[PDB]
PDB file of C-alpha atoms in Angstrom:
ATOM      1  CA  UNK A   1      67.135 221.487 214.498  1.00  0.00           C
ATOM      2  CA  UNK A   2      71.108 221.295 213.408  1.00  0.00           C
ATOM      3  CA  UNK A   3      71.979 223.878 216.331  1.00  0.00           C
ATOM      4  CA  UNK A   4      75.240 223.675 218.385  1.00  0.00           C
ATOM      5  CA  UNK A   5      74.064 224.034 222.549  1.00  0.00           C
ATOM      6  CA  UNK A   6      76.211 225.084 225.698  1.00  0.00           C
ATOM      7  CA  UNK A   7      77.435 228.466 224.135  1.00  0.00           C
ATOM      8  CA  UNK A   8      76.425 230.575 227.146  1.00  0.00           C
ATOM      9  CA  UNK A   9      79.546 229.447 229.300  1.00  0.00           C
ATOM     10  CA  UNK A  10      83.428 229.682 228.249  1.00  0.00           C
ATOM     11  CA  UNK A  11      84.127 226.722 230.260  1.00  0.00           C
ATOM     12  CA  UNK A  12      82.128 224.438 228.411  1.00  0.00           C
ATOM     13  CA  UNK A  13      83.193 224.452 224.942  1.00  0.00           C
ATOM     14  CA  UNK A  14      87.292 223.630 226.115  1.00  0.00           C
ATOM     15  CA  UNK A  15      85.589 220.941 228.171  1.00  0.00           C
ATOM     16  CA  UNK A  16      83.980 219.131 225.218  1.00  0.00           C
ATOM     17  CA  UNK A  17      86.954 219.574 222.577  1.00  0.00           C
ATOM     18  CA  UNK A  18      89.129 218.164 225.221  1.00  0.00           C
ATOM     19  CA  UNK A  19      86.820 215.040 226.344  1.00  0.00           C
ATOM     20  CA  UNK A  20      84.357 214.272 223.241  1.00  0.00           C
ATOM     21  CA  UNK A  21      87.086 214.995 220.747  1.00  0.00           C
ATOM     22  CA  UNK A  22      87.937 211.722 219.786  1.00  0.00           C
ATOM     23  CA  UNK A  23      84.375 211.335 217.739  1.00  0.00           C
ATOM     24  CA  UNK A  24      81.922 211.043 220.378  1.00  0.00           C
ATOM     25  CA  UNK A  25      79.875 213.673 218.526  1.00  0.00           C
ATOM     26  CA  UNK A  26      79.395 214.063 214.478  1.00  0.00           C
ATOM     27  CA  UNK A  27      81.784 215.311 213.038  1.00  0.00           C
ATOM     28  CA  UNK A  28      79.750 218.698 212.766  1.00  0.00           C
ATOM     29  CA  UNK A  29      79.450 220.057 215.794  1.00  0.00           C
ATOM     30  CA  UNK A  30      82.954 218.925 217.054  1.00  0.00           C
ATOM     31  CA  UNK A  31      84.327 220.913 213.607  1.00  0.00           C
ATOM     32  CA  UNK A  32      82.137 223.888 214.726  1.00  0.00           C
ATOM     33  CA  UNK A  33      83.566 223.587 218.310  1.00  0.00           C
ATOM     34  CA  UNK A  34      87.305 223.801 216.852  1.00  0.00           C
ATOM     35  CA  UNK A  35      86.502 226.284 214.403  1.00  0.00           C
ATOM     36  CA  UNK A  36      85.486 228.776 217.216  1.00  0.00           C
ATOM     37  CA  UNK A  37      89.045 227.908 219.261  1.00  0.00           C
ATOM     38  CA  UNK A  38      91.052 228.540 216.709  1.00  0.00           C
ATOM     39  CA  UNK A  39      88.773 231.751 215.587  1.00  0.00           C
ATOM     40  CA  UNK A  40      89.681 232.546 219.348  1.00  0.00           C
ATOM     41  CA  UNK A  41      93.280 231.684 219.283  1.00  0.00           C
ATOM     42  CA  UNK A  42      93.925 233.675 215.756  1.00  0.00           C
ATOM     43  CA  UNK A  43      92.627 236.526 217.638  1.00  0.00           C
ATOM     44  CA  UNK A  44      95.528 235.996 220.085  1.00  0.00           C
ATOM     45  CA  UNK A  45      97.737 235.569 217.611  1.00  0.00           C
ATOM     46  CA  UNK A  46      96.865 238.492 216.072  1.00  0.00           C
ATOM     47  CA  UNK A  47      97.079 240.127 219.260  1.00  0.00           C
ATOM     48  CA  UNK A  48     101.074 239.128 220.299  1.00  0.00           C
ATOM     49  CA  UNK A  49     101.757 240.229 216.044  1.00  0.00           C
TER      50      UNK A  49
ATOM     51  CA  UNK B   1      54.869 210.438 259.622  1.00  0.00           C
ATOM     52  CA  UNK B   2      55.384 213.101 256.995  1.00  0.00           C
ATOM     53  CA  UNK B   3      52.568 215.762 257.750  1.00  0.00           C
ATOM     54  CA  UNK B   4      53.898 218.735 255.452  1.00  0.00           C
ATOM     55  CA  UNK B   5      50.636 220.475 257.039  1.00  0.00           C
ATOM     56  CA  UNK B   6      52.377 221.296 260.472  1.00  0.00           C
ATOM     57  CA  UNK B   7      55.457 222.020 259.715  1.00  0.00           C
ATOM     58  CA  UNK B   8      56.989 220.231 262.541  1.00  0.00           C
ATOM     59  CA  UNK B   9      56.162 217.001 260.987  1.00  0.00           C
ATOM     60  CA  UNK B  10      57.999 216.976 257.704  1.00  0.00           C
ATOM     61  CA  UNK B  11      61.592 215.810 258.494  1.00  0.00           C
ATOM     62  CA  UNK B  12      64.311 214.443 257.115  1.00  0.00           C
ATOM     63  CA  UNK B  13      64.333 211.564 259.490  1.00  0.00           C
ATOM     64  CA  UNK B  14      60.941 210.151 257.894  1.00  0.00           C
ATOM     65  CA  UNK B  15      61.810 211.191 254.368  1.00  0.00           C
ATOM     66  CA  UNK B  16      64.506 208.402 254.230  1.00  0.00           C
ATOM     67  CA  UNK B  17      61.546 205.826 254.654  1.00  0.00           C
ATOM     68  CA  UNK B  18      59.943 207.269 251.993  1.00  0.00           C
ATOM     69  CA  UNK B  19      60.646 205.532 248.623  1.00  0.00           C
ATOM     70  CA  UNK B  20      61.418 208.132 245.916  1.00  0.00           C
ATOM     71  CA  UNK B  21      58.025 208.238 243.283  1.00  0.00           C
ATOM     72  CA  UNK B  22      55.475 208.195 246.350  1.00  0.00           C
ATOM     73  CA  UNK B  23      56.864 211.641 247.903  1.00  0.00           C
ATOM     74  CA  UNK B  24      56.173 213.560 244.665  1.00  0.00           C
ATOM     75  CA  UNK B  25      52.960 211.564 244.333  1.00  0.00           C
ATOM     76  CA  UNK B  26      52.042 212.797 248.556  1.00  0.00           C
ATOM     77  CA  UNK B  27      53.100 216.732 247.981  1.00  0.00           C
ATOM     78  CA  UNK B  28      50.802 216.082 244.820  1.00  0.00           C
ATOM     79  CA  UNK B  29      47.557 215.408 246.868  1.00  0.00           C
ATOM     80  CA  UNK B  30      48.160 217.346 249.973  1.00  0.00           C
ATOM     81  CA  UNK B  31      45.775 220.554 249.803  1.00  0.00           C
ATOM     82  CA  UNK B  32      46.856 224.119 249.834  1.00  0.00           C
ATOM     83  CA  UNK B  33      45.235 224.498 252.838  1.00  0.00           C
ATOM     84  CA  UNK B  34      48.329 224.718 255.769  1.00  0.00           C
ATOM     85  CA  UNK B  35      47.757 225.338 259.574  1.00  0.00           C
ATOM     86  CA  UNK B  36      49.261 228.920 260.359  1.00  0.00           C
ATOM     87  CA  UNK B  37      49.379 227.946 264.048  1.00  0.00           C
ATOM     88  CA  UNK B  38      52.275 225.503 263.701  1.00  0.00           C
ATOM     89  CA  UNK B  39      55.268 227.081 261.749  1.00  0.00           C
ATOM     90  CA  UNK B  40      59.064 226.724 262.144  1.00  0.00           C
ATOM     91  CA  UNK B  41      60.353 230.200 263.846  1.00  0.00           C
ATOM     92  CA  UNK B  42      63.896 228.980 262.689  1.00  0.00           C
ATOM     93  CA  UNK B  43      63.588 229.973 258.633  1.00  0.00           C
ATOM     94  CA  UNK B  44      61.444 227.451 257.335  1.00  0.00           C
ATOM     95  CA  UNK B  45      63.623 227.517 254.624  1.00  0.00           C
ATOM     96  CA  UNK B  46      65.637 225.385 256.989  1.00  0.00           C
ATOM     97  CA  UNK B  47      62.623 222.245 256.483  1.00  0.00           C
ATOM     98  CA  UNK B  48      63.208 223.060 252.635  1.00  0.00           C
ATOM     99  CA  UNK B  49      66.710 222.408 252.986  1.00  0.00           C
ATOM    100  CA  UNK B  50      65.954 219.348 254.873  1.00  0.00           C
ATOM    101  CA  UNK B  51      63.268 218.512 252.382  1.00  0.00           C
ATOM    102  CA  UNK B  52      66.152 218.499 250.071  1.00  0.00           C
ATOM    103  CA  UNK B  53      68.904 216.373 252.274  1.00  0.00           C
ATOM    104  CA  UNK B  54      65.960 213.808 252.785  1.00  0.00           C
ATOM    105  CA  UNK B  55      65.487 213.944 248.817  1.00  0.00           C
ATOM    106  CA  UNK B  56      68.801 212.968 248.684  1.00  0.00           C
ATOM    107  CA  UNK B  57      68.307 210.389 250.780  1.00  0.00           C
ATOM    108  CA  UNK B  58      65.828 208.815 249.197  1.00  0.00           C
ATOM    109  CA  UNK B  59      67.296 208.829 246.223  1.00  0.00           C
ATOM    110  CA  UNK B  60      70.724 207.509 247.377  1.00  0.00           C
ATOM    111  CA  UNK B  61      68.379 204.340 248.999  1.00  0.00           C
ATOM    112  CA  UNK B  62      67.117 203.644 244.784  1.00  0.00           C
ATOM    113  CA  UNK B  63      70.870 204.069 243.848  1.00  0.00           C
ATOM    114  CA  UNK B  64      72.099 201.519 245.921  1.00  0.00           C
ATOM    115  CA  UNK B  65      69.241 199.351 245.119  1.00  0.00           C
ATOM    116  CA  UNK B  66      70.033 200.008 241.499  1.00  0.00           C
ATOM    117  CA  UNK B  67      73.692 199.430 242.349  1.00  0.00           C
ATOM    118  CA  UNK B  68      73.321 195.776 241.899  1.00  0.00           C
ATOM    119  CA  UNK B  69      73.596 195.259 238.724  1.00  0.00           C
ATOM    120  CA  UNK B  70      76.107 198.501 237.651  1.00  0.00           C
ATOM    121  CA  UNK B  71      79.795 198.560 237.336  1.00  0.00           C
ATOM    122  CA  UNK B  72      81.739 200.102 239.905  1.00  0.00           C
ATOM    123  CA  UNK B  73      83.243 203.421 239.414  1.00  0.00           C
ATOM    124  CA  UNK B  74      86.760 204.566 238.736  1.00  0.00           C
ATOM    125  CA  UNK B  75      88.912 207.860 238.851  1.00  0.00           C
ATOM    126  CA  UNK B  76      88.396 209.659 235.881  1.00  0.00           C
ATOM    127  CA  UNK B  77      91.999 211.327 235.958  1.00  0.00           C
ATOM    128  CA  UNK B  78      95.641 210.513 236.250  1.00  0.00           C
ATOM    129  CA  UNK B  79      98.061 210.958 239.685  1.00  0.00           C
ATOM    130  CA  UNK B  80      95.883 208.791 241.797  1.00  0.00           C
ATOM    131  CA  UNK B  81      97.322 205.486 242.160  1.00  0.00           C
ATOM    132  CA  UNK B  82      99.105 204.187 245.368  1.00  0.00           C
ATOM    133  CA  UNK B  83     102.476 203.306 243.820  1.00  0.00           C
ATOM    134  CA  UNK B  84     102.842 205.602 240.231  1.00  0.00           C
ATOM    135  CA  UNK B  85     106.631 204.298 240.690  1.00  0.00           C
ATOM    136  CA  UNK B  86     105.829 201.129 239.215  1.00  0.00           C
ATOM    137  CA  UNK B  87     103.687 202.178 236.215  1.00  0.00           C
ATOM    138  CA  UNK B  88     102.393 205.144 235.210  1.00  0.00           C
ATOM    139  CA  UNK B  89      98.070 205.704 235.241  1.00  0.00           C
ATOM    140  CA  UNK B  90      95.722 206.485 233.442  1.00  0.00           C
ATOM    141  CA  UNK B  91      92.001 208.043 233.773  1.00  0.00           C
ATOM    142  CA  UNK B  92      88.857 207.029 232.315  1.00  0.00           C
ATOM    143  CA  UNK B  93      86.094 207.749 230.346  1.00  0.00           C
ATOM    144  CA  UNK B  94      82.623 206.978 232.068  1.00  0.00           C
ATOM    145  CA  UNK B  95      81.083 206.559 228.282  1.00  0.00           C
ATOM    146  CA  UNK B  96      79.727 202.932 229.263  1.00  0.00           C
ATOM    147  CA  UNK B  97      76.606 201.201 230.212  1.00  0.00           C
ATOM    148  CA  UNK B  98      75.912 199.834 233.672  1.00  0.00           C
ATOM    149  CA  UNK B  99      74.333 196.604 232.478  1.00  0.00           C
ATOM    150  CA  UNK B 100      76.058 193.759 233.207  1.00  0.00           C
ATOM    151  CA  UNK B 101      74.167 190.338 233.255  1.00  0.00           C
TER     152      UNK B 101
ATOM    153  CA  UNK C   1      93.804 221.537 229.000  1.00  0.00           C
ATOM    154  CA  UNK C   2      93.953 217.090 228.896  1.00  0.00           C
ATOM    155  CA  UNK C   3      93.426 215.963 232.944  1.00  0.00           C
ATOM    156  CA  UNK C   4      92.907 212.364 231.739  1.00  0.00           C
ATOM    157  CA  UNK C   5      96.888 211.954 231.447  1.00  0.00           C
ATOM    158  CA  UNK C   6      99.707 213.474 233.671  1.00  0.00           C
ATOM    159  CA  UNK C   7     101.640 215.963 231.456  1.00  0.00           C
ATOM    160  CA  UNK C   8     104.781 214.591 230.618  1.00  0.00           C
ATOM    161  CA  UNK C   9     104.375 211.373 231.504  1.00  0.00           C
ATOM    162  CA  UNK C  10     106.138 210.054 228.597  1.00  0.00           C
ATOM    163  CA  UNK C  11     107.486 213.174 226.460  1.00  0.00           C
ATOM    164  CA  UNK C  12     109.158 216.327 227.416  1.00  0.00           C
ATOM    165  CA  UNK C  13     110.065 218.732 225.079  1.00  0.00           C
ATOM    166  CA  UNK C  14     113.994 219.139 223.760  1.00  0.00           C
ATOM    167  CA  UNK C  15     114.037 221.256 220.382  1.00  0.00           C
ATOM    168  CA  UNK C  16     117.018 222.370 218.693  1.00  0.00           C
ATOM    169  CA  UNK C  17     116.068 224.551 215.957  1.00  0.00           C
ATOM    170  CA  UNK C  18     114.924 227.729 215.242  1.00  0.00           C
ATOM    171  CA  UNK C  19     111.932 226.278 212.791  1.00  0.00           C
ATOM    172  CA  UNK C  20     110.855 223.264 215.515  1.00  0.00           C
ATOM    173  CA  UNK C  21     111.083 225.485 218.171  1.00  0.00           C
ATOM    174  CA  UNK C  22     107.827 225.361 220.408  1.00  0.00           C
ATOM    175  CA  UNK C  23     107.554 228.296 223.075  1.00  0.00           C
ATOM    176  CA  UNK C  24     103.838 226.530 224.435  1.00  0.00           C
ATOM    177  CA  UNK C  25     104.648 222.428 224.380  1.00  0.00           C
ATOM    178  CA  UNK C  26     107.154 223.905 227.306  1.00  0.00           C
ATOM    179  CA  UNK C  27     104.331 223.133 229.644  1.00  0.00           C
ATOM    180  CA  UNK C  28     105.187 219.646 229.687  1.00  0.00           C
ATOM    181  CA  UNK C  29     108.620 220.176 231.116  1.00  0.00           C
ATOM    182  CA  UNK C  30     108.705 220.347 235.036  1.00  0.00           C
ATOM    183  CA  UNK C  31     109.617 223.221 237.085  1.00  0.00           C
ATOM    184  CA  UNK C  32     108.194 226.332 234.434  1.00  0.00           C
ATOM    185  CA  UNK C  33     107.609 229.107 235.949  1.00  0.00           C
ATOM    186  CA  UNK C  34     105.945 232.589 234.027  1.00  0.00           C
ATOM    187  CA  UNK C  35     109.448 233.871 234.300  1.00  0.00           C
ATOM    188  CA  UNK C  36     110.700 231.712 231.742  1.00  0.00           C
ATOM    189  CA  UNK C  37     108.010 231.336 230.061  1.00  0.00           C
ATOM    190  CA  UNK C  38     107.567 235.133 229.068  1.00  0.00           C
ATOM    191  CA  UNK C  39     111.337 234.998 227.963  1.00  0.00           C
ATOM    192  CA  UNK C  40     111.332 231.655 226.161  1.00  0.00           C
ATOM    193  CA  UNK C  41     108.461 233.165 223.871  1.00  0.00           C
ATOM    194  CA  UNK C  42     110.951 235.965 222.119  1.00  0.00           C
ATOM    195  CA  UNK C  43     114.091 233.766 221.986  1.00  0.00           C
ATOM    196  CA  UNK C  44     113.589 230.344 220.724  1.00  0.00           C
ATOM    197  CA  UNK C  45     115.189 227.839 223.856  1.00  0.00           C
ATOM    198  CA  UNK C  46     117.930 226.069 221.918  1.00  0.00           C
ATOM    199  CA  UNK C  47     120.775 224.558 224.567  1.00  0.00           C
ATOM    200  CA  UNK C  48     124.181 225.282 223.737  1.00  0.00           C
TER     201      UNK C  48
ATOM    202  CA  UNK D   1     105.589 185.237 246.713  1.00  0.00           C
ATOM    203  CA  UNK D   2     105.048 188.485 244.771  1.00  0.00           C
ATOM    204  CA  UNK D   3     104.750 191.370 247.524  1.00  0.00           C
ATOM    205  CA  UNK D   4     106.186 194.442 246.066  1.00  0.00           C
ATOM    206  CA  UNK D   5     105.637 196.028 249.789  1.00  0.00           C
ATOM    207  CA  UNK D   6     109.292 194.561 250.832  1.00  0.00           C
ATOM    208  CA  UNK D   7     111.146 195.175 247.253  1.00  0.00           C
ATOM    209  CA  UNK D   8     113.117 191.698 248.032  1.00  0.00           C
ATOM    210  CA  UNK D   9     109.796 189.717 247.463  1.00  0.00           C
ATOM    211  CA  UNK D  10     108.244 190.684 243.765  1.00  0.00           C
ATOM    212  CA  UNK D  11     111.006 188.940 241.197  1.00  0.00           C
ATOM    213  CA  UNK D  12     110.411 187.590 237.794  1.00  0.00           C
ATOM    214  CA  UNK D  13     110.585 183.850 239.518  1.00  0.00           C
ATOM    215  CA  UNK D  14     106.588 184.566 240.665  1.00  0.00           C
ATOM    216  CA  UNK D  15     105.394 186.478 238.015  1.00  0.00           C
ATOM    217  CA  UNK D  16     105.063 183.848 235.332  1.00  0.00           C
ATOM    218  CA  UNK D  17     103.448 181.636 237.866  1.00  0.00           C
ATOM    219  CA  UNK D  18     100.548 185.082 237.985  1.00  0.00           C
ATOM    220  CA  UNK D  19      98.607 185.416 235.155  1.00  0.00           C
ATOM    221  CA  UNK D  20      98.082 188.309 233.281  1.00  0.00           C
ATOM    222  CA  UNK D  21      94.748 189.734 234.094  1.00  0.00           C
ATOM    223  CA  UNK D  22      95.318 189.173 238.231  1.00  0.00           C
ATOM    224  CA  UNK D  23      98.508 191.241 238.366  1.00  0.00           C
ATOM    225  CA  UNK D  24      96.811 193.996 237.015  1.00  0.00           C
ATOM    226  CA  UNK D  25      94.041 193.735 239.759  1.00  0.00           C
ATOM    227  CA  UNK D  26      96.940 192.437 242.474  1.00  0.00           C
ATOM    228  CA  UNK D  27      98.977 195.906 242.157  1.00  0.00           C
ATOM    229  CA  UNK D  28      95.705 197.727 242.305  1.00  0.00           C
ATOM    230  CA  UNK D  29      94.602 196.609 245.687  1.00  0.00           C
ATOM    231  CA  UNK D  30      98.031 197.205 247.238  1.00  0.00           C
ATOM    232  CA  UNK D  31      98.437 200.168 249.370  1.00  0.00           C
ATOM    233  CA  UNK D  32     100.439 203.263 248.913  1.00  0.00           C
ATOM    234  CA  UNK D  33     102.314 202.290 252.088  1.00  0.00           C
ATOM    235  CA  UNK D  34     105.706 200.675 250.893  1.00  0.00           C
ATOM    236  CA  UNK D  35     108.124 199.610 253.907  1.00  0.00           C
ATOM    237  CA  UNK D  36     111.236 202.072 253.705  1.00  0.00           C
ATOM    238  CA  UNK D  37     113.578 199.895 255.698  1.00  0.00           C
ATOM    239  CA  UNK D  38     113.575 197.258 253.045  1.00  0.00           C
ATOM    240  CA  UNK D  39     115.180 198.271 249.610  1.00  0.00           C
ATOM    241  CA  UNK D  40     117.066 197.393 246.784  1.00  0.00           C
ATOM    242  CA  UNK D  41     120.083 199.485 247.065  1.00  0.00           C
ATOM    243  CA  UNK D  42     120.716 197.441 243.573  1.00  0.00           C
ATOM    244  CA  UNK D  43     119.292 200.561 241.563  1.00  0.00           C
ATOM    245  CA  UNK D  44     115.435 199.130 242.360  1.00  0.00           C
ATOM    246  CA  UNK D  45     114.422 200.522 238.649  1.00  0.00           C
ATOM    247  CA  UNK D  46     116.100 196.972 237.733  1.00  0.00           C
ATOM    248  CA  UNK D  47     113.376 195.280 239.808  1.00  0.00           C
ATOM    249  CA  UNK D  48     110.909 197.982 237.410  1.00  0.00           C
ATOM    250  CA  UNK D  49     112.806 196.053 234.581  1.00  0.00           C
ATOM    251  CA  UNK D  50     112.547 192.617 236.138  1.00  0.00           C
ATOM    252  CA  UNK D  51     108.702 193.548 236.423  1.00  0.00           C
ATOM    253  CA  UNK D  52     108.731 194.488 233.094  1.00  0.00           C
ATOM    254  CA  UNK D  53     110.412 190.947 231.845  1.00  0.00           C
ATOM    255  CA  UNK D  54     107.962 189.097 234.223  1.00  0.00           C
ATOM    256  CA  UNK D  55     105.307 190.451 232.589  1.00  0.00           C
ATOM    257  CA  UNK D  56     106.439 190.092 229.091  1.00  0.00           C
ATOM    258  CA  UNK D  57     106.835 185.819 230.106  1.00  0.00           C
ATOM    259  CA  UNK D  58     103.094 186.113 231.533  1.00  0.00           C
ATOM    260  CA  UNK D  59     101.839 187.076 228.341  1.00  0.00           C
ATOM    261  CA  UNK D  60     104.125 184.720 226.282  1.00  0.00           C
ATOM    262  CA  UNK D  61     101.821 182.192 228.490  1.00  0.00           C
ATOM    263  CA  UNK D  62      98.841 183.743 227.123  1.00  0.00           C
ATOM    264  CA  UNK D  63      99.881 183.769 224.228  1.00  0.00           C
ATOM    265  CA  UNK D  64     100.939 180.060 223.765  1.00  0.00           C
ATOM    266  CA  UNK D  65      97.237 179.281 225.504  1.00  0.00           C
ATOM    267  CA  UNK D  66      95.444 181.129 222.369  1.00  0.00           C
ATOM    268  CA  UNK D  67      98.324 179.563 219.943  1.00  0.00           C
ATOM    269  CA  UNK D  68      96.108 176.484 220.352  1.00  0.00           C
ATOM    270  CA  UNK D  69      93.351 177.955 217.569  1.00  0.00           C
ATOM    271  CA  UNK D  70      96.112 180.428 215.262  1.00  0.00           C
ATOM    272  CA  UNK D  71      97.549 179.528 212.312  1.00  0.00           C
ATOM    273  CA  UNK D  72     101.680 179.465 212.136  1.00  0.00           C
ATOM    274  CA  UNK D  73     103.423 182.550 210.949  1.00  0.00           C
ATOM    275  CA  UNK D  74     105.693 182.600 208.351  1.00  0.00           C
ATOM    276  CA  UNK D  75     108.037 185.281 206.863  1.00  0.00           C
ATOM    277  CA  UNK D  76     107.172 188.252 205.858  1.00  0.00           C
ATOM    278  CA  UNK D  77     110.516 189.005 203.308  1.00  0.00           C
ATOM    279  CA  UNK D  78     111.888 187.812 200.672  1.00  0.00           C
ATOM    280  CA  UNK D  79     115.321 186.424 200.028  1.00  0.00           C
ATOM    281  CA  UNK D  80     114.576 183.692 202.853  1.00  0.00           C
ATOM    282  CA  UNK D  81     114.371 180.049 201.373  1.00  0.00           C
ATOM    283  CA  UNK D  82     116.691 177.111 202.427  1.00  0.00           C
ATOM    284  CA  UNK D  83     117.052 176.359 198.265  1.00  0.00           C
ATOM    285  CA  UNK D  84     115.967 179.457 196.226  1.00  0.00           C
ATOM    286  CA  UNK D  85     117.733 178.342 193.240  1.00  0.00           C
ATOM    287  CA  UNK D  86     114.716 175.606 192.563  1.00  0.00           C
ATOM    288  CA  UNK D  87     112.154 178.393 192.577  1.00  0.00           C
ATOM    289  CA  UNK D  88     112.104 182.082 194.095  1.00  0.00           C
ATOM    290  CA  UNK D  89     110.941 183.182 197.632  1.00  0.00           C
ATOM    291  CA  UNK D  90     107.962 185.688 198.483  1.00  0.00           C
ATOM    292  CA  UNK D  91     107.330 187.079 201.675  1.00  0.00           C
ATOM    293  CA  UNK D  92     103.390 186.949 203.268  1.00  0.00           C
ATOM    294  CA  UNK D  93     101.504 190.134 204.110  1.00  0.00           C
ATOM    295  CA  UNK D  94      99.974 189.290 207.819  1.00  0.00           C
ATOM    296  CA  UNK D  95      96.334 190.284 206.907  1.00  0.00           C
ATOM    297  CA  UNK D  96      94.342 187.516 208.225  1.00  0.00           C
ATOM    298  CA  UNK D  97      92.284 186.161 211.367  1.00  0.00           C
ATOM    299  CA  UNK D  98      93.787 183.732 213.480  1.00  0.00           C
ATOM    300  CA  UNK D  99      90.725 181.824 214.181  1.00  0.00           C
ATOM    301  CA  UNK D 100      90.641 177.983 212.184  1.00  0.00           C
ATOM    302  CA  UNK D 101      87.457 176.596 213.468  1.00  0.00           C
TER     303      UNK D 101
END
């Protein structure tokens, strides 16, 4: 159905770009998983600014 | 034997004996129809819990049956080696298949 | 956030410049505490 | 032989009798438990570095076991010809398989 799972938790997401981020996965949902941290760590960013 | 109609039967002590499709396949037939008379005053909860352990059991016993033909298992992360001093280590990914021959 | 590999097994960080500075690759040096963590994120750690 | 419990036993001298794969697998084994009272007080990170050239001659002795089937390398540069003034000199870029039949 070309939906990304496992959203509910924080400490899932970290988990899978850390382990299946060597191309496990299609490149799809691994570029949606990244795309999320670093929406997430411009927030920070914007944040310290 | 496992009688899960008096409670004092069911135990974890038989489940073990018990392979692990036939148990599902027993609870499946069994009727809903359970003796009041005999009943654990100690939380039957307690013989779900050791429903479970046996469970576990059971399935441990088709593990190690299916552990004849796997790999066996490494540490998945770095520090744990008995001498690092020598060389460093490494962890590893369990991304395999256990089929060997 | 990587487990599989010690951190700093065979890097740790040494910058000397204002542009390559890094106030988070830090991490892989040993004994970091908050303390200088909080104050290496203003001023960029360049050794004398 | 090669017992890196007391540090005076591994040495380069075994290590090219081991092969490559069984070292590997020998360190592995070996418990965390290293004898204090024996020691190099020779700066042992030399006997790291005499582990390291041990295992660099094991695996020249794998490698001249699969140099049975390669082909022989030549040079990569130019300018490297015993008589270049007969004809000019071309290096070789290293893109091939090994394997001859």
């Amino acid at each position: 159905s070309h939906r990304v799972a496992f959203v509910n938790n924080f400490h899932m997401l970290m988990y899978i770009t850390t382990y299946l981020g060597n191309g496990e996965l299609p490149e799809v949902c691994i570029n949606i998983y990244r795309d999320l941290l670093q929406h997430v760590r411009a927030l920070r960013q914007t944040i310290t600014d | 034997s496992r009688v899960v109609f008096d409670p004092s039967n069911p135990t974890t002590f038989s489940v073990e004996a018990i392979a692990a499709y036939t148990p599902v396949a027993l609870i499946r037939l069994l009727n809903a129809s359970g003796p009041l008379q005999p009943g654990h005053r100690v939380d039957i909860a307690d013989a779900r819990s050791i429903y479970t352990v046996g469970a576990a059991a059971s399935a441990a016993r088709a593990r190690a049956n299916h552990n004849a033909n796997t790999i066996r298992r490494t540490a998945m992360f770095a520090e744990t080696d008995p001498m690092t001093w020598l060389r460093p280590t490494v962890g590893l990914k369990r991304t395999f298949n256990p089929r060997i021959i | 956030y990587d487990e599989t590999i010690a951190t700093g097994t065979f890097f740790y960080p040494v910058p000397v410049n204002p542009l390559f500075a890094c106030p988070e690759h830090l991490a892989s040096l040993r004994g970091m505490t908050n303390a200088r963590r909080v104050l290496a994120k203003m001023v960029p750690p360049i050794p004398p």
